Amino acid sequence: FVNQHLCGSHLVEALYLVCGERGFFYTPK
Amino acid sequence: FVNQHLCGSHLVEALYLVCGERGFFYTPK
Amino acid sequence: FVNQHLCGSHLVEALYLVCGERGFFYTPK
Amino acid sequence: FVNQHLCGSHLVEALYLVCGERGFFYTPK
Amino acid sequence: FVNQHLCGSHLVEALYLVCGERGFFYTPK
Amino acid sequence: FVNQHLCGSHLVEALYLVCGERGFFYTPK
Amino acid sequence: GIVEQCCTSICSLYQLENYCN
Amino acid sequence: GIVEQCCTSICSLYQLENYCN
Amino acid sequence: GIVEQCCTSICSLYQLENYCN
Amino acid sequence: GIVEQCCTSICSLYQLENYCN
Amino acid sequence: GIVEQCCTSICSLYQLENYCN
Amino acid sequence: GIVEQCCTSICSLYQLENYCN
Numbered sequence: 550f551v552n553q554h555l556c557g558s559h560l561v562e563a564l565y566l567v568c569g570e571r572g573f574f575y576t577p578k
Numbered sequence: 579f580v581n582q583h584l585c586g587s588h589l590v591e592a593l594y595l596v597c598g599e600r601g602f603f604y605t606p607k
Numbered sequence: 608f609v610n611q612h613l614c615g616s617h618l619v620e621a622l623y624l625v626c627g628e629r630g631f632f633y634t635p636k
Numbered sequence: 637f638v639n640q641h642l643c644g645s646h647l648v649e650a651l652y653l654v655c656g657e658r659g660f661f662y663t664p665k
Numbered sequence: 666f667v668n669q670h671l672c673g674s675h676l677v678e679a680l681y682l683v684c685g686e687r688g689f690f691y692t693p694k
Numbered sequence: 695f696v697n698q699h700l701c702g703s704h705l706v707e708a709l710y711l712v713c714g715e716r717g718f719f720y721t722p723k
Numbered sequence: 724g725i726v727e728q729c730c731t732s733i734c735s736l737y738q739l740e741n742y743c744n
Numbered sequence: 745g746i747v748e749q750c751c752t753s754i755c756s757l758y759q760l761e762n763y764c765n
Numbered sequence: 766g767i768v769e770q771c772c773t774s775i776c777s778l779y780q781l782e783n784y785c786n
Numbered sequence: 787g788i789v790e791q792c793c794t795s796i797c798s799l800y801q802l803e804n805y806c807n
Numbered sequence: 808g809i810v811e812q813c814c815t816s817i818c819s820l821y822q823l824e825n826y827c828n
Numbered sequence: 829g830i831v832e833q834c835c836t837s838i839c840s841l842y843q844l845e846n847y848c849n
């Protein structure tokens with residue numbers, strides 16, 4: 550589903566702004 | 579620092595595209 | 608100026624995420 | 637609806653490029 | 666369809682990262 | 695160079711919005 | 724509303740000009 | 745999963761805080 | 766068309782390589 | 787303004803909230 | 808080119824239109 | 829780290845893959 554890929558691209562930018570120096574891990578699978 | 583933040587914003591976008599289903603860990607300096 | 612424009616591009620994206628349903632007024636220098 | 641949030645993120649970047657120095661107001665509600 | 670416009674905005678950033686110095690052409694029609 | 699890459703990332707986004715259905719050819723230096 | 728106009732139908736560049744300060 | 749939670753329902757800013765290292 | 770191929774089905778990184786100048 | 791402060795120093799989430807409606 | 812002009816000086820919408828197909 | 833290398837020198841796709849899970 551292409552809609553999943555588009556939403557993930559907005560999740561990575563949200564985690565980057567929120568986590569900041571802490572960092573984030575993105576793991577859909 | 580400000581410009582370092584801007585590079586990371588595009589950096590996480592690039593990492594998300596390149597890795598894909600594998601995912602990644604983002605750790606800043 | 609060029610780099611100021613780039614910061615504003617990420618700035619409005621950050622403001623949109625943080626505020627949400629409230630909305631915001633963006634006024635540049 | 638998540639599709640509303642995604643479209644809004646593209647509206648803020650469109651207003652920023654169009655309004656420029658004038659500025660914009662985003663008010664969904 | 667608004668979903669077409671959103672996906673195209675993600676295609677241009679994917680071509681830019683992939684093509685790099687080569688460059689890309691975007692031609693939906 | 696790094697900052698030149700960042701400007702192109704926003705440049706292709708701006709060109710995509712402005713042109714629209716016409717499309718464009720992106721050629722870097 | 725901008726959400727009820729430019730997000731249910733595609734808006735041209737001038738359609739975004741209306742909401743500029 | 746973050747894909748199964750924050751992409752099927754809209755997540756507030758704090759909902760994104762959970763996945764921070 | 767790139768719109769009719771990479772936007773109705775998810776395209777891998779190499780699928781984007783085809784349209785590079 | 788917003789540019790004069792946040793584009794020269796990193797602005798925290800509380801500082802961004804001051805610009806919300 | 809496009810980078811040599813717009814990445815050193817802010818390009819107006821008309822200038823961007825010159826690069827459209 | 830990732831910032832110390834890719835934000836000062838352009839990183840190729842192989843270099844980005846080293847940061848993938």
Ligand SMILES: *C(=O)CCCCCCCCCCCCC
Nearest residue numbers: 579580581582583606607831832
């Ligand atoms: C976080 O504190 C950043 C640490 C990296 C050092 C940043 C400055 C390195 C020298 C570059 C100076 C260029 C800007 C005047």
Ligand SMILES: *C(=O)CCCCCCCCCCCCC
Nearest residue numbers: 608609610611612635636789790
């Ligand atoms: C719009 O005209 C910007 C007004 C703010 C001043 C920009 C320059 C401030 C000093 C920084 C110089 C650094 C770049 C050489």
Ligand SMILES: *C(=O)CCCCCCCCCCCCC
Nearest residue numbers: 695696697698699722723810811
């Ligand atoms: C690709 O090789 C870029 C070619 C354009 C020249 C870049 C440098 C021009 C002078 C600006 C120096 C400012 C940074 C110290």
Ligand SMILES: *C(=O)CCCCCCCCCCCCC
Nearest residue numbers: 637639640664665726727730731
């Ligand atoms: C605030 O909630 C905005 C009020 C109007 C929302 C309308 C949402 C309609 C559902 C989405 C339809 C279009 C999907 C792209």
Ligand SMILES: *C(=O)CCCCCCCCCCCCC
Nearest residue numbers: 550552553577578747748751752
């Ligand atoms: C990896 O494949 C993620 C596993 C869960 C995927 C769920 C996808 C459901 C289809 C999309 C529904 C929501 C559309 C916005």
Ligand SMILES: *C(=O)CCCCCCCCCCCCC
Nearest residue numbers: 666668669693694768769772773
């Ligand atoms: C120009 O109009 C492009 C020609 C092909 C458009 C196909 C649009 C199909 C409707 C969207 C289906 C997929 C939604 C993600």
Ligand SMILES: [Cl-]
Nearest residue numbers: 584585613700
């Ligand atoms: Cl930048």
Ligand SMILES: [Cl-]
Nearest residue numbers: 555642643671
């Ligand atoms: Cl989207």
Ligand SMILES: [Zn+2]
Nearest residue numbers: 555559642671
């Ligand atoms: Zn999007």
Ligand SMILES: [Zn+2]
Nearest residue numbers: 584588613700
């Ligand atoms: Zn940038």
